[PDB]
Design a protein around this ligand. Structure first.
Ligand SMILES: N[C@@H](CCC(=O)N[C@@H](CS)C(=O)NCC(=O)O)C(=O)O
Ligand SMILES: N[C@@H](CCC(=O)N[C@@H](CS)C(=O)NCC(=O)O)C(=O)O
Lengths: 307, 308
């Protein structure tokens, strides 16, 4: 935590014309060589932002820094000793909270990934992943982004509806199971996880993706939890009733997005498993990383022909 | 913890058909009714072997049982009886299992373990080595009406010993070595050996019904007590999570085959087992939360009685 500007223990919109979005300030016009993502490869929220960058072909426009997977007493850090942890490749800060202080040195609240950072004004555009992926969706189209709209008007209300119960019962739902303070809270969170997986399995037996045969952001947001579920949540958070590999549709959906060009390289299981097992000392005091459930995400899925 | 000079912070006699000594300890523990008692936890795979052998060999009329409480906390095993199927000390109403050890030796130094084979006549411990208790049970009551059955018959002894040796090292104890590992390197080497032994067992149990052939032996029993705990506990709690027993055709068939033999299911209590491991092992599982647990159904028919 950061309390009135020191360490104990941002809702602007990037926009095609530079007009402010529906919250925050304006002056964040889309353009090359200006904007930067600070992420962990471990964090499913930050991961959404990396997936949207690959699908929208934003590599030439958005540079990236990867914080160390080990999130200790200092929160996220720029220690660069772990492969694919890059350091702060902008200012070579040492701690993520530094970028936050630089933007607002009386800042009160959490120091989270991802952060969308403006290299021109040295400040933070956003640290809301749900909104960063909406920017990436359209803000660079005129500049040459790849075609695709992952939040198109006709699906927005279905999308928002999905995002709401997936966030609560699945994205966040695993954390509620894993960090439950009591048996009773654990039972209730984990039951909800699995009751939602069952509902998802049925949806994904009707068509390719959650809303039908188009890929949307609701898919992406589900997917970054799914891809972490067998390697971490099953054992580490004790969501162990079934593995994603036991569901015909969820596992096919897992593999279908995994195998989209560019997506696999966004997935670093070393960061993922080191982060969760070694960082959560209140649930895993030993810091031992489990060998982890067997799976093979490269096996053909057939969901492209089936649907 | 453990007992040091009689203070809370090794028994190797043999019960025999004629009261002669076994290869260790002293003599005088002749088989007979109303003399011998087991103290067990329903959670403990080593204590479970002695419950299974008691059923297979029909020893209920000879051996009475107390079940300690599944929660092993600051006092070691206790006779708190607030848990269903925990019985208290149905002989002396002690408080703690360690009191039984102190009675046998009032300045005892060592661990206080289940199972204990206890002699009601002389108020002492016959044995607290499960591997030897099952061999006593196997033959010592045979002239008194034990059901026919030899689970360590002369012709199979070398094969059974060779199996027990690696099974014990890499699977019965191997899951403990993984779950209690102190470093990543030691966890890695232990969990690797668990799954390597499971792959080899899966190949064995694809050739015939049981480990040595078509006959059940004590090597099967000893394996089985670890297998029956593997999906409910070891997979998550000890991080032995690469594969579940339910993913292996032959191990899962063999797990169900023994489960479904008359008398065996009543020896299995998943409440004790899950409560014991998740709730007692604070160094591994500080919160004491019991995971919902990997899905399985041990009642499904197995086919192994005809397949081979
Ligand atoms: N709403 C934020 C959530 C991001 C978030 O919660 N990130 C976690 C990663 S799991 C984090 O950086 N936590 C650091 C902390 O809380 O100290 C988003 O959507 O981006
Ligand atoms: N070799 C003994 C060991 C039995 C054993 O280690 N039992 C564990 C039960 S899982 C125990 O009572 N542990 C208590 C302790 O070590 O403090 C046997 O085969 O019976």
């Amino acid at each position: 935590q950061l309390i009135d500007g020191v360490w104990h223990d941002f809702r602007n919109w990037l926009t095609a014309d530079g007009a402010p979005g529906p919250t925050g300030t304006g002056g964040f016009i889309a353009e090359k060589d200006r904007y930067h993502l600070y992420v962990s490869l471990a964090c499913p929220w930050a991961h959404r932002t990396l997936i949207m960058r690959k699908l929208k072909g934003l590599e030439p426009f958005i540079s990236v820094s990867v914080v160390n997977p080990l999130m200790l007493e200092n929160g996220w850090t720029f220690d660069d000793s772990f492969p694919g942890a890059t350091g702060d490749t902008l200012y070579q800060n040492e701690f993520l909270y530094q970028l936050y202080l630089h933007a607002d040195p009386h800042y009160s609240g959490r120091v989270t990934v991802p952060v969308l950072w403006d290299k021109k004004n040295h400040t933070i555009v956003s640290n809301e992943s749900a909104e960063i992926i909406r920017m990436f969706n359209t803000a660079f189209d005129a500049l040459g982004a790849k075609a695709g709209d992952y939040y198109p008007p006709a699906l927005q209300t279905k999308i928002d509806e999905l995002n709401g119960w997936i966030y609560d019962t699945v994205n966040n739902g695993v954390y509620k199971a894993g960090f439950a303070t009591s048996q009773e809270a654990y039972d209730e969170a984990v039951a909800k996880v699995f009751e939602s997986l069952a509902r998802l399995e049925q949806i994904l037996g009707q068509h390719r993706y959650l809303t039908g045969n188009q890929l949307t952001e609701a898919d992406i947001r589900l997917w970054t939890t799914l891809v972490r579920f067998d390697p971490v949540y099953v054992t580490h958070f004790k969501c162990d009733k079934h593995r994603i590999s036991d569901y015909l549709n969820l596992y096919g959906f897992l593999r279908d997005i995994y195998q989209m060009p560019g997506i696999a390289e966004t997935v670093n299981f070393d960061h993922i498993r080191n982060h969760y097992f070694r960082s959560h000392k209140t649930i895993n005091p030993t810091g031992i990383i489990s060998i982890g459930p067997w799976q093979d995400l490269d096996e053909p899925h057939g969901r492209d022909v089936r649907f």
